[PDB]
Short mmCIF file of C-alpha atoms and ligand atoms in Angstrom, two decimals:
data_model
loop_
_atom_site.label_atom_id
_atom_site.label_comp_id
_atom_site.label_asym_id
_atom_site.label_seq_id
_atom_site.Cartn_x
_atom_site.Cartn_y
_atom_site.Cartn_z
CA UNK A 4 0.00 0.00 0.00
CA UNK A 5 2.03 3.04 -1.23
CA UNK A 6 2.34 6.25 0.82
CA UNK A 7 0.70 9.24 -0.87
CA UNK A 8 2.68 12.16 -2.37
CA UNK A 9 -0.56 14.23 -2.60
CA UNK A 10 -3.71 14.52 -0.48
CA UNK A 11 -6.78 16.62 -0.78
CA UNK A 12 -7.93 18.73 2.15
CA UNK A 13 -11.42 20.20 2.64
CA UNK A 14 -11.62 23.42 4.63
CA UNK A 15 -15.05 24.63 5.77
CA UNK A 16 -15.93 27.78 7.62
CA UNK A 17 -19.41 28.56 8.82
CA UNK A 18 -20.75 31.11 11.27
CA UNK A 19 -23.90 29.26 12.33
CA UNK A 20 -25.56 32.34 13.91
CA UNK A 21 -26.25 30.40 17.14
CA UNK A 22 -28.88 28.24 15.27
CA UNK A 23 -28.92 24.50 14.70
CA UNK A 24 -28.09 23.51 11.18
CA UNK A 25 -30.69 22.18 8.75
CA UNK A 26 -31.10 18.40 8.32
CA UNK A 27 -28.90 18.29 5.19
CA UNK A 28 -25.57 20.12 4.85
CA UNK A 29 -23.94 17.81 2.27
CA UNK A 30 -23.66 20.65 -0.36
CA UNK A 31 -21.00 22.22 1.94
CA UNK A 32 -18.74 19.12 1.87
CA UNK A 33 -19.37 18.66 -1.86
CA UNK A 34 -18.20 22.25 -2.67
CA UNK A 35 -21.54 22.97 -4.44
CA UNK A 36 -23.16 26.41 -4.70
CA UNK A 37 -21.56 29.63 -5.88
CA UNK A 38 -17.93 30.39 -6.76
CA UNK A 39 -15.27 27.88 -7.76
CA UNK A 40 -17.21 24.65 -7.30
CA UNK A 41 -16.25 21.02 -7.45
CA UNK A 42 -17.14 18.82 -10.43
CA UNK A 43 -20.13 16.48 -9.94
CA UNK A 44 -17.97 13.57 -11.12
CA UNK A 45 -15.93 13.89 -7.87
CA UNK A 46 -18.91 13.77 -5.47
CA UNK A 47 -18.20 10.23 -4.21
CA UNK A 48 -14.44 10.76 -3.92
CA UNK A 49 -13.65 11.48 -0.26
CA UNK A 50 -11.15 14.17 0.63
CA UNK A 51 -8.30 12.82 2.73
CA UNK A 52 -8.83 15.34 5.55
CA UNK A 53 -11.84 17.50 6.38
CA UNK A 54 -11.31 20.52 8.60
CA UNK A 55 -14.50 22.20 9.76
CA UNK A 56 -14.42 25.61 11.46
CA UNK A 57 -17.58 27.00 13.00
CA UNK A 58 -18.32 30.25 14.76
CA UNK A 59 -21.41 31.03 16.81
CA UNK A 60 -21.80 27.24 17.02
CA UNK A 61 -24.67 26.38 19.41
CA UNK A 62 -24.10 22.60 19.33
CA UNK A 63 -22.20 20.40 21.73
CA UNK A 64 -19.06 18.76 20.30
CA UNK A 65 -20.98 15.47 20.33
CA UNK A 66 -23.97 16.87 18.46
CA UNK A 67 -21.79 18.40 15.73
CA UNK A 68 -19.51 15.33 15.37
CA UNK A 69 -22.63 13.17 14.80
CA UNK A 70 -23.88 15.58 12.09
CA UNK A 71 -20.48 15.88 10.39
CA UNK A 72 -19.62 12.16 10.45
CA UNK A 73 -23.11 11.08 9.25
CA UNK A 74 -22.93 13.79 6.49
CA UNK A 75 -19.58 12.48 5.19
CA UNK A 76 -20.69 8.84 5.49
CA UNK A 77 -23.83 9.67 3.41
CA UNK A 78 -21.68 11.37 0.70
CA UNK A 79 -18.77 8.92 0.57
CA UNK A 80 -19.85 5.70 2.36
CA UNK A 81 -16.66 6.16 4.46
CA UNK A 82 -16.75 6.38 8.25
CA UNK A 83 -14.21 9.11 9.04
CA UNK A 84 -11.97 9.08 12.08
CA UNK A 85 -11.92 12.04 14.43
CA UNK A 86 -8.37 13.49 14.52
CA UNK A 87 -9.15 16.43 16.78
CA UNK A 88 -11.89 18.68 18.06
CA UNK A 89 -11.36 21.89 20.01
CA UNK A 90 -13.85 24.57 21.10
CA UNK A 91 -13.31 28.03 22.58
CA UNK A 92 -16.70 29.46 23.59
CA UNK A 93 -18.71 29.05 20.34
CA UNK A 94 -15.65 28.82 18.03
CA UNK A 95 -14.87 25.22 17.04
CA UNK A 96 -12.58 23.21 14.87
CA UNK A 97 -13.08 19.57 13.88
CA UNK A 98 -10.52 17.53 11.94
CA UNK A 99 -11.71 14.28 10.35
CA UNK A 100 -9.59 11.90 8.28
CA UNK A 101 -10.13 8.80 6.16
CA UNK A 102 -9.52 5.67 8.28
CA UNK A 103 -6.54 4.63 6.10
CA UNK A 104 -4.78 7.81 7.44
CA UNK A 105 -5.23 7.00 11.12
CA UNK A 106 -1.62 5.72 11.53
CA UNK A 107 -0.15 8.39 9.15
CA UNK A 108 -1.27 11.13 11.59
CA UNK A 109 0.68 11.87 14.75
CA UNK A 110 1.78 14.76 17.00
CA UNK A 111 -1.76 16.13 17.21
CA UNK A 112 -1.87 19.54 18.96
CA UNK A 113 -4.80 21.81 19.75
CA UNK A 114 -4.87 25.28 21.19
CA UNK A 115 -6.90 28.47 21.39
CA UNK A 116 -6.28 32.19 21.71
CA UNK A 117 -8.75 34.62 23.28
CA UNK A 118 -8.42 38.06 21.67
CA UNK A 119 -8.99 41.55 23.14
CA UNK A 120 -8.95 42.89 26.76
CA UNK A 121 -11.80 43.42 29.35
CA UNK A 122 -14.79 44.71 27.19
CA UNK A 123 -13.26 42.96 24.10
CA UNK A 124 -12.29 39.64 25.87
CA UNK A 125 -15.15 37.13 26.04
CA UNK A 126 -16.22 35.86 22.67
CA UNK A 127 -13.65 36.41 19.81
CA UNK A 128 -10.46 34.42 19.20
CA UNK A 129 -9.24 31.34 17.48
CA UNK A 130 -8.89 27.60 17.80
CA UNK A 131 -6.35 25.50 15.96
CA UNK A 132 -5.12 22.03 15.30
CA UNK A 133 -1.79 20.76 14.00
CA UNK A 134 -0.42 17.33 13.27
CA UNK A 135 2.10 15.48 11.18
CA UNK A 136 0.78 13.60 8.14
CA UNK A 137 3.74 11.27 7.42
CA UNK A 138 6.68 13.66 6.71
CA UNK A 139 4.42 16.75 6.32
CA UNK A 140 3.34 19.20 9.03
CA UNK A 141 -0.18 20.59 8.77
CA UNK A 142 -1.69 23.48 10.71
CA UNK A 143 -5.24 24.76 10.74
CA UNK A 144 -6.59 27.91 12.38
CA UNK A 145 -10.25 28.84 12.73
CA UNK A 146 -10.61 32.42 13.91
CA UNK A 147 -13.64 34.54 14.70
CA UNK A 148 -12.25 38.09 14.55
CA UNK A 149 -13.74 41.34 15.83
CA UNK A 150 -16.94 42.42 14.06
CA UNK A 151 -17.97 45.77 12.65
CA UNK A 152 -17.06 47.66 9.50
CA UNK A 153 -15.02 50.33 11.41
CA UNK A 154 -12.84 47.73 13.24
CA UNK A 155 -10.48 46.49 10.53
CA UNK A 156 -7.44 47.57 12.65
CA UNK A 157 -8.80 45.51 15.62
CA UNK A 158 -9.14 42.50 13.28
CA UNK A 159 -5.50 42.98 12.20
CA UNK A 160 -4.50 43.11 15.86
CA UNK A 161 -6.54 39.97 16.56
CA UNK A 162 -4.64 38.24 13.70
CA UNK A 163 -1.26 39.18 15.18
CA UNK A 164 -2.27 38.01 18.69
CA UNK A 165 -3.50 34.69 17.28
CA UNK A 166 -0.33 34.00 15.24
CA UNK A 167 1.89 35.05 18.19
CA UNK A 168 0.12 33.07 20.90
CA UNK A 169 -1.45 30.00 19.29
CA UNK A 170 0.83 27.15 20.44
CA UNK A 171 0.72 24.53 17.71
CA UNK A 172 3.34 22.40 16.02
CA UNK A 173 6.84 21.53 17.14
CA UNK A 174 7.71 23.38 20.41
CA UNK A 175 11.39 22.88 19.52
CA UNK A 176 10.86 25.53 16.77
CA UNK A 177 11.05 28.13 19.55
CA UNK A 178 11.85 31.25 17.41
CA UNK A 179 9.00 30.49 15.01
CA UNK A 180 5.32 31.33 15.19
CA UNK A 181 2.62 29.30 13.46
CA UNK A 182 3.31 31.15 10.15
CA UNK A 183 6.58 29.18 9.90
CA UNK A 184 5.92 25.90 11.75
CA UNK A 185 3.96 24.03 9.02
CA UNK A 186 4.50 22.72 5.53
CA UNK A 187 0.91 23.86 4.94
CA UNK A 188 -1.00 26.30 7.16
CA UNK A 189 -4.69 26.96 6.51
CA UNK A 190 -6.24 29.95 8.25
CA UNK A 191 -9.98 30.40 7.92
CA UNK A 192 -12.97 31.63 9.79
CA UNK A 193 -15.33 34.53 10.20
CA UNK A 194 -12.55 37.00 9.72
CA UNK A 195 -15.21 39.71 9.67
CA UNK A 196 -13.61 42.04 7.11
CA UNK A 197 -16.26 44.08 5.32
CA UNK A 198 -16.93 45.77 1.99
CA UNK A 199 -16.00 49.35 2.82
CA UNK A 200 -18.53 51.40 0.87
CA UNK A 201 -20.86 54.10 2.14
CA UNK A 202 -24.00 52.93 3.99
CA UNK A 203 -26.12 54.87 1.43
CA UNK A 204 -24.76 52.44 -1.25
CA UNK A 205 -26.44 49.36 0.36
CA UNK A 206 -29.05 48.93 -2.36
CA UNK A 207 -26.44 49.56 -5.10
CA UNK A 208 -24.29 46.80 -3.55
CA UNK A 209 -27.26 44.39 -3.50
CA UNK A 210 -27.92 45.24 -7.19
CA UNK A 211 -24.30 44.42 -8.06
CA UNK A 212 -24.57 41.10 -6.19
CA UNK A 213 -27.76 40.15 -8.06
CA UNK A 214 -25.86 40.82 -11.34
CA UNK A 215 -22.92 38.68 -10.08
CA UNK A 216 -20.71 41.73 -10.61
CA UNK A 217 -18.29 41.51 -7.70
CA UNK A 218 -15.31 43.52 -9.05
CA UNK A 219 -16.32 46.95 -7.60
CA UNK A 220 -17.21 45.26 -4.31
CA UNK A 221 -13.98 43.20 -4.01
CA UNK A 222 -11.94 46.40 -4.71
CA UNK A 223 -13.35 47.68 -1.34
CA UNK A 224 -13.05 44.37 0.61
CA UNK A 225 -11.04 45.27 3.70
CA UNK A 226 -9.19 41.93 3.81
CA UNK A 227 -7.96 42.33 0.21
CA UNK A 228 -7.02 46.01 0.78
CA UNK A 229 -5.34 45.42 4.15
CA UNK A 230 -3.43 42.46 2.63
CA UNK A 231 -2.33 44.61 -0.34
CA UNK A 232 -1.02 47.28 2.13
CA UNK A 233 0.78 44.50 4.09
CA UNK A 234 -1.27 45.19 7.22
CA UNK A 235 -2.38 41.56 7.79
CA UNK A 236 -1.91 38.02 6.46
CA UNK A 237 1.49 38.81 4.99
CA UNK A 238 2.68 35.92 2.79
CA UNK A 239 -0.69 34.15 2.76
CA UNK A 240 -2.65 33.26 -0.37
CA UNK A 241 -6.37 33.39 -1.06
CA UNK A 242 -8.15 32.04 -4.13
CA UNK A 243 -10.07 34.61 -6.18
CA UNK A 244 -13.54 35.19 -4.78
CA UNK A 245 -16.22 34.45 -7.37
CA UNK A 246 -19.20 33.85 -4.97
CA UNK A 247 -21.58 36.41 -3.51
CA UNK A 248 -20.93 38.00 -0.12
CA UNK A 249 -21.72 35.40 2.58
CA UNK A 250 -23.07 37.88 5.14
CA UNK A 251 -25.53 39.23 6.24
CA UNK A 252 -28.58 37.25 5.07
CA UNK A 253 -32.11 37.05 6.33
CA UNK A 254 -32.41 33.51 7.74
CA UNK A 255 -34.44 30.77 5.94
CA UNK A 256 -33.88 32.33 2.48
CA UNK A 257 -30.83 33.55 0.51
CA UNK A 258 -32.94 36.05 -1.42
CA UNK A 259 -32.36 38.93 1.02
CA UNK A 260 -29.40 40.70 2.55
CA UNK A 261 -30.35 42.14 5.99
CA UNK A 262 -28.01 45.14 6.20
CA UNK A 263 -29.97 47.90 8.00
CA UNK A 264 -29.02 48.97 11.57
CA UNK A 265 -31.08 47.33 14.33
CA UNK A 266 -30.93 47.29 18.16
CA UNK A 267 -29.80 43.64 17.73
CA UNK A 268 -26.78 44.87 15.66
CA UNK A 269 -25.78 47.61 18.15
CA UNK A 270 -27.25 50.07 15.62
CA UNK A 271 -24.55 49.07 13.10
CA UNK A 272 -25.10 48.48 9.38
CA UNK A 273 -23.92 45.19 7.98
CA UNK A 274 -23.42 45.89 4.29
CA UNK A 275 -22.97 42.64 2.35
CA UNK A 276 -19.51 41.37 2.99
CA UNK A 277 -17.15 38.46 2.49
CA UNK A 278 -16.76 37.81 6.22
CA UNK A 279 -16.07 34.10 5.77
CA UNK A 280 -12.69 33.25 4.26
CA UNK A 281 -10.00 30.63 3.72
CA UNK A 282 -6.37 31.55 3.32
CA UNK A 283 -3.23 29.44 3.29
CA UNK A 284 0.51 29.58 3.47
CA UNK A 285 2.74 26.76 2.39
CA UNK A 286 6.51 26.49 2.47
CA UNK A 287 8.23 27.57 -0.74
CA UNK A 288 8.02 25.17 -3.73
CA UNK A 289 5.58 22.78 -2.05
CA UNK A 290 2.62 21.78 -4.21
CA UNK A 291 -0.60 23.41 -3.04
CA UNK A 292 -3.46 24.09 -5.44
CA UNK A 293 -6.90 25.39 -4.53
CA UNK A 294 -9.48 23.22 -6.36
CA UNK A 295 -12.62 24.94 -4.94
CA UNK A 296 -13.56 28.12 -3.13
CA UNK A 297 -17.16 29.02 -2.81
CA UNK A 298 -20.30 29.24 -0.73
CA UNK A 299 -23.38 27.08 -0.39
CA UNK A 300 -26.71 28.37 -1.60
CA UNK A 301 -29.01 25.86 0.15
CA UNK A 302 -28.01 26.09 3.90
CA UNK A 303 -30.01 29.01 5.30
CA UNK A 304 -30.31 28.56 9.12
CA UNK A 305 -27.66 31.25 9.69
CA UNK A 306 -27.23 34.87 8.62
CA UNK A 307 -23.96 33.60 7.05
CA UNK A 308 -23.59 31.05 4.29
CA UNK A 309 -21.04 28.31 4.72
CA UNK A 310 -17.83 28.64 2.74
CA UNK A 311 -15.80 25.75 1.36
CA UNK A 312 -12.33 25.49 -0.02
CA UNK A 313 -10.47 22.42 -1.20
CA UNK A 314 -6.84 21.89 -1.86
CA UNK A 315 -4.36 19.48 -3.38
CA UNK A 316 -1.41 19.47 -1.01
CA UNK A 317 1.96 17.84 -1.51
CA UNK A 318 2.99 15.43 1.25
CA UNK A 319 6.12 13.43 1.84
CA UNK A 320 6.77 9.98 3.34
CA UNK A 321 8.35 9.22 6.77
CA UNK A 322 11.86 8.52 5.34
CA UNK A 323 14.21 5.85 6.81
CA UNK A 324 17.75 5.20 5.56
CA UNK A 325 20.48 2.84 6.83
CA UNK A 326 22.01 6.02 8.41
CA UNK A 327 19.47 8.66 9.60
CA UNK A 328 17.27 8.95 11.47
CA UNK A 329 19.55 8.38 14.51
CA UNK A 330 22.73 9.63 12.86
CA UNK A 331 23.94 11.97 10.09
CA UNK A 332 24.62 10.87 6.49
CA UNK A 333 28.13 12.16 5.59
CA UNK A 334 27.14 12.05 1.84
CA UNK A 335 24.80 15.04 2.55
CA UNK A 336 25.72 18.67 3.32
CA UNK A 337 24.17 22.15 3.11
CA UNK A 338 26.55 25.11 2.66
CA UNK A 339 25.70 28.85 2.60
CA UNK A 340 27.91 31.28 0.61
CA UNK A 341 27.85 35.12 0.51
CA UNK A 342 24.83 35.29 2.93
CA UNK A 343 23.59 38.48 4.50
CA UNK A 344 20.55 39.61 6.39
CA UNK A 345 19.08 43.08 5.75
CA UNK A 346 17.19 44.18 8.85
CA UNK A 347 14.77 47.08 9.40
CA UNK A 348 15.84 47.36 13.11
CA UNK A 349 17.29 50.66 14.37
CA UNK A 350 19.15 48.61 17.08
CA UNK A 351 22.97 47.93 17.19
CA UNK A 352 23.51 44.47 18.80
CA UNK A 353 25.41 41.62 17.19
CA UNK A 354 23.26 38.96 15.46
CA UNK A 355 23.64 35.22 14.92
CA UNK A 356 21.49 32.79 12.96
CA UNK A 357 19.72 29.61 13.96
CA UNK A 358 18.95 26.98 11.31
CA UNK A 359 16.06 24.67 12.19
CA UNK A 360 14.92 21.74 10.10
CA UNK A 361 13.64 18.18 10.65
CA UNK A 362 16.47 17.18 8.22
CA UNK A 363 18.94 18.11 11.07
CA UNK A 364 19.39 16.17 14.32
CA UNK A 365 18.94 19.54 16.11
CA UNK A 366 19.08 23.22 15.31
CA UNK A 367 22.39 24.88 14.43
CA UNK A 368 23.63 28.24 15.77
CA UNK A 369 25.98 30.31 13.60
CA UNK A 370 28.79 32.63 14.69
CA UNK A 371 27.84 36.32 14.95
CA UNK A 372 27.64 38.19 11.66
CA UNK A 373 29.45 41.45 10.86
CA UNK A 374 27.21 44.51 10.95
CA UNK A 375 27.55 47.06 8.13
CA UNK A 376 25.43 50.16 7.29
CA UNK A 377 23.33 49.84 4.07
CA UNK A 378 23.35 52.88 1.66
CA UNK A 379 19.64 53.68 2.46
CA UNK A 380 19.95 53.54 6.33
CA UNK A 381 19.56 49.70 6.80
CA UNK A 382 21.37 47.22 9.03
CA UNK A 383 23.19 44.61 6.86
CA UNK A 384 24.49 41.61 8.80
CA UNK A 385 27.17 39.81 6.74
CA UNK A 386 27.89 36.10 7.39
CA UNK A 387 30.33 35.75 4.44
CA UNK A 388 31.50 32.10 4.09
CA UNK A 389 31.37 31.86 7.92
CA UNK A 390 28.03 29.89 8.23
CA UNK A 391 28.34 26.32 9.68
CA UNK A 392 28.08 23.40 7.19
CA UNK A 393 24.68 21.70 7.94
CA UNK A 394 24.74 17.92 8.34
CA UNK A 395 21.44 16.35 7.25
CA UNK A 396 20.30 13.01 8.74
CA UNK A 397 19.60 11.57 5.24
CA UNK A 398 21.57 12.29 2.01
CA UNK A 399 19.11 10.72 -0.47
CA UNK A 400 18.07 13.55 -2.86
CA UNK A 401 14.48 12.15 -2.97
CA UNK A 402 14.32 13.13 0.72
CA UNK A 403 16.64 16.12 0.96
CA UNK A 404 15.33 18.15 -2.03
CA UNK A 405 11.87 18.08 -0.34
CA UNK A 406 13.14 19.66 2.90
CA UNK A 407 13.20 23.26 4.11
CA UNK A 408 15.47 25.26 6.41
CA UNK A 409 13.89 27.72 8.83
CA UNK A 410 16.18 30.65 9.65
CA UNK A 411 15.96 32.95 12.66
CA UNK A 412 18.26 35.92 13.07
CA UNK A 413 18.69 36.49 16.81
CA UNK A 414 20.22 39.26 18.93
CA UNK A 415 23.38 38.15 20.77
CA UNK A 416 22.34 40.59 23.59
CA UNK A 417 18.78 39.25 24.15
CA UNK A 418 18.62 35.93 22.19
CA UNK A 419 15.44 37.28 20.86
CA UNK A 420 14.48 36.60 17.15
CA UNK A 421 14.41 39.74 14.99
CA UNK A 422 13.30 37.81 11.91
CA UNK A 423 12.21 34.42 10.72
CA UNK A 424 12.15 32.92 7.25
CA UNK A 425 12.25 29.70 5.27
CA UNK A 426 14.48 28.40 2.45
CA UNK A 427 13.42 25.49 0.23
CA UNK A 428 16.01 22.81 -0.67
CA UNK A 429 14.01 22.11 -3.90
CA UNK A 430 16.97 23.39 -5.95
CA UNK A 431 17.52 23.52 -9.69
CA UNK A 432 20.89 21.73 -9.17
CA UNK A 433 23.02 20.02 -6.48
CA UNK A 434 26.77 20.67 -5.97
CA UNK A 435 26.04 24.09 -7.63
CA UNK A 436 26.05 27.55 -5.91
CA UNK A 437 22.52 28.87 -6.33
CA UNK A 438 20.82 32.04 -5.10
CA UNK A 439 18.55 31.75 -2.04
CA UNK A 440 16.19 34.32 -0.57
CA UNK A 441 13.53 34.62 2.06
CA UNK A 442 11.78 37.63 3.54
CA UNK A 443 12.18 37.81 7.32
CA UNK A 444 9.20 38.45 9.57
CA UNK A 445 8.69 38.79 13.30
CA UNK A 446 5.18 38.55 14.76
CA UNK A 447 4.15 38.10 11.12
CA UNK A 448 5.35 41.61 10.11
CA UNK A 449 8.20 42.20 7.67
CA UNK A 450 11.47 42.90 9.48
CA UNK A 451 14.09 42.21 6.80
CA UNK A 452 15.45 39.84 4.23
CA UNK A 453 17.96 37.02 4.09
CA UNK A 454 19.77 36.27 0.85
CA UNK A 455 22.88 34.53 -0.37
CA UNK A 456 23.79 31.33 -2.05
CA UNK A 457 23.35 27.68 -1.18
CA UNK A 458 25.50 24.56 -2.29
CA UNK A 459 23.52 21.28 -1.58
CA UNK A 460 25.33 17.91 -1.69
CA UNK A 461 23.09 14.81 -1.83
CA UNK A 462 24.17 11.17 -2.32
CA UNK A 463 23.51 11.59 -6.12
O1 WLG B 501 -6.37 8.57 18.08
C1 WLG B 501 -6.77 9.68 17.89
C2 WLG B 501 -6.65 10.29 16.49
O2 WLG B 501 -6.04 9.33 15.67
C3 WLG B 501 -6.08 9.58 14.29
F1 WLG B 501 -7.32 9.47 13.77
F2 WLG B 501 -5.67 10.85 14.06
N1 WLG B 501 -7.39 10.45 18.98
C4 WLG B 501 -7.54 9.91 20.38
C5 WLG B 501 -7.92 10.95 21.43
C6 WLG B 501 -9.16 11.69 21.06
C7 WLG B 501 -9.18 12.18 19.65
C8 WLG B 501 -10.19 13.28 19.32
C9 WLG B 501 -10.51 11.82 18.97
C10 WLG B 501 -7.92 11.86 18.83
#
């Protein structure tokens, strides 16, 4: 029974509006409705992993697991295994997997983050799950961010708190937040970004939606505009939105957007918006292809419509050689030439690097770099040919070319990371000096760049 080199992953996000779901929700898991939808010919083909995020979920974990599992069994005739379930207040994540994957999945982690302070602490935040699927790390975040059209900055803040404080994945990757810990990270939820147009334009917006003309609405979507200004979700991807706004509907129909201010809304307008989103970030040069992104049309218990997204995702096998794991393979080496970090910091400490990778027995600390002044004010930290030669556990190019090196640049004074990034070993050539590059972030914000050359030796 061969190990897969690809899997498909279903991501669902649904703000249930505190109401029980209808008796049939299969259209959600089939990626049927509006947007980029899944071909009918695939309806019986199970996804490998289903990850369901809910917000304003009124059900018990048991109640929702029974609905989800029975839904999938009706669609696929497969009884899925529960990988993880985690709930914070009314924010929930469920991970289900085909039974054949039960012993491919390990290192299952769950966590939550509560966002805000005092007033603003008590119902928003995020839940998440991570695990290993054979040689591949997967992370999933379901967040319910702050509501309200005039709170996009709060949402951005909620994002940064969640990525800083959600404790998923390998705790040994201490300098790295969840935006660097996973081969594939999926972040979804009721992110609550709105279409920023004047209230007086409500009926115009509705008109545009009825015409399926989304371009002048998407150009005012706060998530797209904040992402373009690098205010949030730096280095994440989102598929093009080709489905109608998923909020705010009158319940029991989809024929009406309920946008007008009400006591129940805190006297706020809810212009039609794409509140409900799926984004991802995968390590460089790993296969990830969105194969659906849309909303259901036939699930109407909530003032939101469910959103679906599906992905092909590259995965690797749990590699064993006669040498590593449990030793190095002297036929493998990773060398860095002419490397330098460019940092936005105004500080003047010395810096050193840490290289972290599951292709190493443990992380590697460099010598301090040499600080120079860049011609436009910047700190340039030069490592020259000084960086330590990295000794991978396995030299086989079928393993090593699929690996990645996480890099942290740390202050010698404080041992605090000033920037984190990732370099793929999926090179054009081995035994050949080749350019490398990663942006450096810290708390998910851009802090610099790391660039130089790499020389990878494999057993071939
Ligand atoms: O064994 C597994 C998962 O295994 C495989 F399906 F990922 N779990 C035991 C503890 C409780 C749990 C939520 C159901 C996960």
